[PDB]
Amino acid sequence: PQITLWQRPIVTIKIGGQLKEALLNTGADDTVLEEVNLPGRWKPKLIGGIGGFVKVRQYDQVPIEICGHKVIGTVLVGPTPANVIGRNLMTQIGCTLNF
Amino acid sequence: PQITLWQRPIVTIKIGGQLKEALLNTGADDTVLEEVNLPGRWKPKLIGGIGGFVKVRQYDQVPIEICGHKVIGTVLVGPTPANVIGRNLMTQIGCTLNF
Ligand SMILES: OC[C@H]1O[C@@H](O)[C@H](O)[C@@H](O)[C@@H]1O
């Protein structure tokens, strides 16, 4: 798909038998999602930093679908002003900037 | 150009004749740049918001070049962790997300 940038590039993602909305953010290195009960082991992770850090949980090799593209990737789970799909998953789905 | 997202998509812009470094941020609506003495009239603008707003200067129809594309658009000038090219300018160069 080709997504123009007149509007915020919000897409539907499928994460664990659950459909959500997330913004494709090339300004973000990682993918952060509002609390969801992903199964299994996870590692603590600090994100953000300016003014202090926020702790989230790092889930690895998570299966997730982005506009019908099934990918495996690291998902950070915790508080966030919105769901954000970062560069880590955009390379998995082969997403690039073109002009 | 086609820019893959394995690394931060940082690019070179030409503004006020100056050569500068900036990040292509689809997560951002607007373009915000380090202090620069752009000439002529401007408008106060509030940006950010979470925890408070930051006051910047809004300059319209500024000539700017991005990776060899001469374009025209609104540039906000004020403090910022780093220079950011937002969607307003990415539409002007016809930059899209593709996967
Ligand atoms: O973003 C604007 C800022 O640019 C910095 O390079 C300057 O040291 C600071 O004085 C100015 O306010």
Q: Where are the domains of chain A?
A: 1-99
CB pairs under 8 A between A and B: 101
The rounded distance, in Å, linking the Cα atoms of A36 and B55 is 36
The three-class DSSP label of residue B82 is coil
From the centroid of its chain, how far is CA A19? 13
Pick from A60, A51, A63, A56: which is nearest to A14 by CA?
A63
Angle at A98 (CA atoms; ends A82, B38), nearest 5 degrees:
75
CB of B36 closer than 6 A to ligand 1? no
Query: Quick check: B26 and A4 CB within 8 A?
Result: no
Written as six digits, the tokens of B57 are 């200067």
Pocket mutation for ligand 1, best pick of B15, B21, B33, B35 (most atoms within 8 Å of C-beta): B35
CA distances from A70 to A92, B37, B42, B88 (A): 9, 47, 46, 30
- Closest-CA distance, B4 to chain A, in angstroms, reads 5
Q: Which of B2, B67, B87 sits opposite A96 (nearest CB)?
A: B2
Distance CA B27, CA B25 (A): 5
Cβ atoms within 10 Å of B20's Cβ, excluding its own: 16
Q: Is B35 in the pocket of ligand 1 (CB under 6 A)?
A: yes
Return the closest-CA partner of residue B15 out of B1, B30, B36, B43.
Answer: B36
Q: Which atom from ligand 1 is nearest to the alpha carbon of B33?
A: 1
Dist. CA B78 → ligand 1 center (Å): 7
Structure tokens at A36: 């969801």
Q: What is the dotted CATH code of the domain comprising B1-99?
A: 2.40.70.10
C-alpha distance across the termini of chain A, in Å: 15
CA–CA gap between residue A78 and residue B20 (Å, rounded): 35
**B31, B45 contact by CB (below 8 A):** no
d(CA A86, CA B27): 9
SS3 A87: helix
Comparing CB atoms, the residue among A4, A26, A69 nearest residue B9 is: A26
Instruction: Concatenate the DSSP letters of all residues of A28-79 into one string.
Output: -SS-EES-----S--EEEEEEETTEEEEEEEEEEEEEEETTEEEEEEEEES-
Resolution in A: 1.9
Q: How many angstroms separate the CA atoms of A33 and A16, rounded?
A: 12
A69: chain B residues, CB-CB within 8 Å: 99
**Whole-angstrom Cα distance, residue B99 to residue B97?**
7
